[PDB]
Amino acid sequence: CVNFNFNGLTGTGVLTESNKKFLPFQQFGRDIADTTDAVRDPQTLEIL
Amino acid sequence: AYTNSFTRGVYYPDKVFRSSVLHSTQDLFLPFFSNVTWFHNPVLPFNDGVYFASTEKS
Numbered sequence: 001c002v003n004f005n006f007n008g009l010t011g012t013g014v015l016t017e018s019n020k021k022f023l024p025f026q027q028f029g030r031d032i033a034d035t036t037d038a039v040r041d042p043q044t045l046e047i048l
Numbered sequence: 049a050y051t052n053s054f055t056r057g058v059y060y061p062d063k064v065f066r067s068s069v070l071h072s073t074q075d076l077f078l079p080f081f082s083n084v085t086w087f088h089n090p091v092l093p094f095n096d097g098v099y100f101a102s103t104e105k106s
């Protein structure tokens with residue numbers, strides 16, 4: 001459990017290795033109910 | 049000249065990922081089945097953004 005602040009967004013949660021395939025230009029995920037779901041790490045090209 | 053913009057002019061309004069979702073968003077878009085000016089170097093206005101398209105062979 002970490003309090004995290006990615007490029008422009010901030011939150012609290014656990015970051016885990018993902019299973020999704022973000023596009024090269026996509027940064028922040030979003031669930032159906034307008035909630036942040038996944039992020040692109042600014043340095044490592046891995047989706048969390 | 050004029051032409052029909054059938055269903056063109058849709059652009060990702062942000063850098064946000066969404067899967068299997070129907071999202072409602074309001075912004076500047078090209079209205080469906082509207083008039084688009086067709087040219088064969090005139091100066092044009094830039095009121096609130098411009099969609100530009102080109103067919104090229106050379």
Ligand SMILES: *[C@@H]1O[C@H](CO)[C@@H](O)[C@H](O)[C@H]1NC(C)=O
Nearest residue numbers: 024040041042043044045046
């Ligand atoms: C950012 O820098 C690190 C080392 O400081 C490097 O390993 C990484 O590949 C770099 N990322 C990009 C996208 O250049």
Ligand SMILES: *[C@@H]1O[C@H](CO)[C@@H](O)[C@H](O)[C@H]1NC(C)=O
Nearest residue numbers: 050051079080081082083084
């Ligand atoms: C395009 O222009 C013609 C006449 O120039 C007009 O009859 C037509 O309604 C226009 N298209 C739209 C979608 O308004």
